[PDB]
Amino acid sequence: APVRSLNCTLRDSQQKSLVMSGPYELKALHLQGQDMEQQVVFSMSFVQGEESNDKIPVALGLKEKNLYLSCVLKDDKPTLQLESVDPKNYPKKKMEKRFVFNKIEINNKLEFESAQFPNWYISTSQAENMPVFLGGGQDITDFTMQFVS
Numbered sequence: 001a002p003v004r005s006l007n008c009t010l011r012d013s014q015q016k017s018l019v020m021s022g023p024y025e026l027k028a029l030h031l032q033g034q035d036m037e038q039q040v041v042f043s044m045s046f047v048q049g050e051e052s053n054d055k056i057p058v059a060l061g062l063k064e065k066n067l068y069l070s071c072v073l074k075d076d077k078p079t080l081q082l083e084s085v086d087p088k089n090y091p092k093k094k095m096e097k098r099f100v101f102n103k104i105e106i107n108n109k110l111e112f113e114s115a116q117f118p119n120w121y122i123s124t125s126q127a128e129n130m131p132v133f134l135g136g137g138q139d140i141t142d143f144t145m146q147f148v149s
Protein backbone atom coordinates (compact mmCIF):
# COMPACT_ATOMS: atom_id res chain seq x y z
CA ALA A 1 0.00 0.00 0.00
CA PRO A 2 1.27 3.55 0.71
CA VAL A 3 4.87 4.08 1.91
CA ARG A 4 5.06 4.48 5.70
CA SER A 5 6.55 7.72 7.15
CA LEU A 6 7.31 9.15 10.62
CA ASN A 7 7.91 12.79 11.62
CA CYS A 8 11.21 13.21 13.50
CA THR A 9 14.16 15.47 14.36
CA LEU A 10 17.84 14.50 14.38
CA ARG A 11 20.60 15.70 16.75
CA ASP A 12 24.33 14.89 16.35
CA SER A 13 26.21 13.19 19.20
CA GLN A 14 27.27 16.69 20.46
CA GLN A 15 23.48 17.40 20.66
CA LYS A 16 23.64 19.92 17.76
CA SER A 17 20.27 20.54 16.06
CA LEU A 18 19.88 20.83 12.22
CA VAL A 19 18.26 23.94 10.59
CA MET A 20 17.57 25.25 7.05
CA SER A 21 20.19 28.10 6.92
CA GLY A 22 19.78 29.00 3.20
CA PRO A 23 18.19 27.79 -0.09
CA TYR A 24 18.90 23.99 -0.33
CA GLU A 25 21.30 24.53 2.65
CA LEU A 26 21.55 22.63 6.00
CA LYS A 27 23.82 23.67 8.94
CA ALA A 28 24.09 22.31 12.54
CA LEU A 29 24.19 24.30 15.82
CA HIS A 30 23.58 24.07 19.56
CA LEU A 31 19.90 25.10 20.08
CA GLN A 32 17.84 25.16 23.28
CA GLY A 33 14.61 26.89 24.42
CA GLN A 34 12.52 29.12 22.08
CA ASP A 35 15.02 28.77 19.18
CA MET A 36 14.30 24.98 18.92
CA GLU A 37 11.26 25.85 16.70
CA GLN A 38 13.94 26.62 14.03
CA GLN A 39 14.93 22.92 13.84
CA VAL A 40 14.18 20.90 10.69
CA VAL A 41 11.40 18.33 11.03
CA PHE A 42 11.96 15.34 8.74
CA SER A 43 9.47 12.94 7.28
CA MET A 44 11.45 9.68 7.45
CA SER A 45 10.03 7.19 4.89
CA PHE A 46 10.71 3.41 5.16
CA VAL A 47 11.63 2.56 1.55
CA GLN A 48 12.56 -0.44 -0.61
CA GLY A 49 16.18 -1.66 -0.37
CA GLU A 50 18.61 -4.18 1.29
CA GLU A 51 17.63 -4.58 5.04
CA SER A 52 19.16 -6.32 8.15
CA ASN A 53 18.44 -6.38 11.95
CA ASP A 54 20.12 -2.98 12.51
CA LYS A 55 20.36 -1.54 8.89
CA ILE A 56 17.02 -0.09 7.60
CA PRO A 57 16.70 1.83 4.26
CA VAL A 58 15.01 5.27 4.65
CA ALA A 59 14.48 8.50 2.75
CA LEU A 60 14.71 11.84 4.58
CA GLY A 61 12.25 14.43 3.29
CA LEU A 62 11.53 17.81 4.95
CA LYS A 63 8.07 17.66 6.64
CA GLU A 64 5.31 18.80 4.17
CA LYS A 65 7.96 19.93 1.61
CA ASN A 66 8.83 18.35 -1.72
CA LEU A 67 12.54 18.36 -0.67
CA TYR A 68 14.67 15.25 0.06
CA LEU A 69 18.26 14.77 1.15
CA SER A 70 20.09 13.34 -1.91
CA CYS A 71 23.61 11.90 -2.53
CA VAL A 72 25.07 12.88 -5.91
CA LEU A 73 28.53 13.32 -7.43
CA LYS A 74 29.47 16.99 -7.48
CA ASP A 75 32.73 18.30 -9.01
CA ASP A 76 33.68 14.52 -8.90
CA LYS A 77 32.95 13.72 -5.15
CA PRO A 78 29.90 12.11 -3.31
CA THR A 79 28.06 15.11 -1.75
CA LEU A 80 24.80 15.70 0.21
CA GLN A 81 22.23 17.98 -1.47
CA LEU A 82 18.62 18.97 -0.90
CA GLU A 83 16.72 18.03 -4.05
CA SER A 84 13.22 19.24 -5.23
CA VAL A 85 10.78 16.53 -6.42
CA ASP A 86 7.30 16.37 -7.99
CA PRO A 87 4.98 16.65 -4.95
CA LYS A 88 2.39 14.43 -6.75
CA ASN A 89 4.82 11.44 -6.90
CA TYR A 90 6.53 11.54 -3.40
CA PRO A 91 7.04 10.04 -1.04
CA LYS A 92 6.99 6.56 -2.64
CA LYS A 93 8.11 3.09 -1.53
CA LYS A 94 10.61 2.68 -4.47
CA MET A 95 12.68 5.88 -3.90
CA GLU A 96 15.60 6.39 -6.36
CA LYS A 97 18.92 5.26 -4.92
CA ARG A 98 20.37 8.82 -4.49
CA PHE A 99 17.56 9.43 -1.86
CA VAL A 100 18.23 6.21 0.13
CA PHE A 101 20.17 6.09 3.45
CA ASN A 102 20.88 2.95 5.44
CA LYS A 103 19.86 3.92 8.98
CA ILE A 104 22.29 1.88 11.14
CA GLU A 105 21.86 1.40 14.94
CA ILE A 106 25.33 1.33 16.65
CA ASN A 107 25.84 1.76 20.44
CA ASN A 108 22.45 3.43 21.09
CA LYS A 109 23.07 5.99 18.26
CA LEU A 110 22.13 6.16 14.54
CA GLU A 111 24.36 6.59 11.49
CA PHE A 112 22.96 7.37 8.03
CA GLU A 113 25.05 5.70 5.33
CA SER A 114 24.43 6.66 1.65
CA ALA A 115 22.88 3.57 -0.12
CA GLN A 116 24.43 4.98 -3.37
CA PHE A 117 27.96 5.64 -1.93
CA PRO A 118 28.96 2.89 0.56
CA ASN A 119 30.83 4.14 3.66
CA TRP A 120 29.83 7.81 3.08
CA TYR A 121 27.76 9.18 5.98
CA ILE A 122 25.57 12.16 6.87
CA SER A 123 28.08 14.21 8.91
CA THR A 124 28.43 17.39 10.91
CA SER A 125 31.46 19.45 11.94
CA GLN A 126 32.43 20.08 15.60
CA ALA A 127 32.28 23.88 14.83
CA GLU A 128 28.99 25.79 15.25
CA ASN A 129 26.83 26.78 12.23
CA MET A 130 28.69 24.70 9.57
CA PRO A 131 27.01 22.75 6.74
CA VAL A 132 25.71 19.19 7.07
CA PHE A 133 27.68 17.12 4.54
CA LEU A 134 28.52 13.66 3.23
CA GLY A 135 31.69 12.28 4.92
CA GLY A 136 33.30 8.83 4.40
CA GLY A 137 39.25 11.07 11.43
CA GLN A 138 37.33 14.18 12.69
CA ASP A 139 33.58 14.14 11.66
CA ILE A 140 30.33 13.42 13.64
CA THR A 141 28.21 10.61 12.03
CA ASP A 142 26.39 9.58 15.24
CA PHE A 143 22.86 10.95 15.76
CA THR A 144 19.84 10.47 17.94
CA MET A 145 16.27 10.69 16.61
CA GLN A 146 13.32 12.41 18.41
CA PHE A 147 9.81 11.29 17.29
CA VAL A 148 7.42 14.29 16.67
CA SER A 149 3.54 14.40 16.52
Ligand SMILES: C[C@H]1CN(C(=O)Cn2cccn2)CCO1
Nearest residue numbers: 025026074079080081082131132
Ligand atom coordinates in the same frame (compact mmCIF):
# COMPACT_ATOMS: atom_id res chain seq x y z
C1 LIG B 1 22.35 19.72 2.28
C2 LIG B 1 23.71 20.44 2.41
C3 LIG B 1 24.12 21.00 1.02
N1 LIG B 1 25.41 21.73 1.18
C4 LIG B 1 26.51 21.66 0.30
O1 LIG B 1 27.50 22.37 0.47
C5 LIG B 1 26.49 20.68 -0.89
N2 LIG B 1 27.82 20.66 -1.52
C6 LIG B 1 28.95 20.01 -1.00
C7 LIG B 1 29.96 20.23 -1.91
C8 LIG B 1 29.39 21.02 -2.96
N3 LIG B 1 28.07 21.28 -2.72
C9 LIG B 1 25.32 22.79 2.19
C10 LIG B 1 24.72 22.27 3.51
O2 LIG B 1 23.53 21.55 3.32
